[PDB]
């Protein structure tokens, strides 16, 4: 592993957890996501990080939504990196959560302008 975070890193466990354990209970179809702008990424840095996206939302959909947050067109480059890996466009946000939720009932992710975790 070699991922760098600040919002998802700063927000204590009791926080990322408190929010998650609630967003999960309150929203069974949604998944608390902590998107991030991978290091060295040739894209704009995000100050939101938090994302309340559904659970059926495919990676392809999630992208298009983040692309705007960074100002990228479908043609533009933008790759998601969770736990330092790239999720399948066919996979659903809900899956990434259950398959990459780093505890705290949260799901943190990254995005770079390359096929590598920004770096």
**Nearest residue to 107 (alpha-carbon basis) of 83, 76, 91:** 83
Measure the CA dihedral 68/70/73/74, to 10°. Answer: -80
Q: Which are the contacts of 19, defined by CB distance < 8 A and separation ≥ 6?
A: 32, 105, 106
| Residue 34 near residue 106 (C-beta atoms within 8 A) | yes
Experiment type: NMR
Backbone phi, psi, residue 65, to 5° = -75, -40
Q: Return the CATH architecture of domain 1-119.
A: Roll (3.10)
Strands 30-34 and 107-108: parallel
Determine the Cα–Cα distance for residues 16 and 80; give it in Å rounded to an integer: 20
Domain boundaries, the chain: 1-119
Determine the Cα–Cα distance for residues 78 and 64; give it in Å rounded to an integer: 9
Distance of CA 68 to the CA centre of its chain: 14
Determine the Cα–Cα distance for residues 21 and 74; give it in Å rounded to an integer: 33
Q: Sign of the C-alpha dihedral, residues 96, 4, 116, 75?
A: positive
Number of H helices, E strands in the chain: 4, 5
Determine the Cα–Cα distance for residues 87 and 71; give it in Å rounded to an integer: 21
């Amino acid at each position: 592993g070699s991922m760098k975070f600040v919002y998802k890193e700063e927000h204590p466990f009791e926080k990322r957890r408190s929010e998650g354990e609630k967003i999960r209970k309150k929203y069974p179809d949604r998944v608390p996501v902590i998107v991030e702008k991978a290091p060295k990424a040739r894209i704009g840095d995000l100050d939101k990080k938090k994302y309340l996206v559904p659970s059926d939302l495919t990676v392809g959909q999630f992208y298009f939504l983040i692309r705007k947050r960074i100002h990228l067109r479908a043609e533009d480059a933008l790759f998601f990196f969770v736990n330092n890996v790239i999720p399948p466009t066919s996979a659903t946000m809900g899956q990434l959560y259950q398959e990459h939720h780093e505890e705290d009932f949260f799901l943190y992710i990254a995005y770079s302008d390359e096929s590598v975790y920004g770096l």
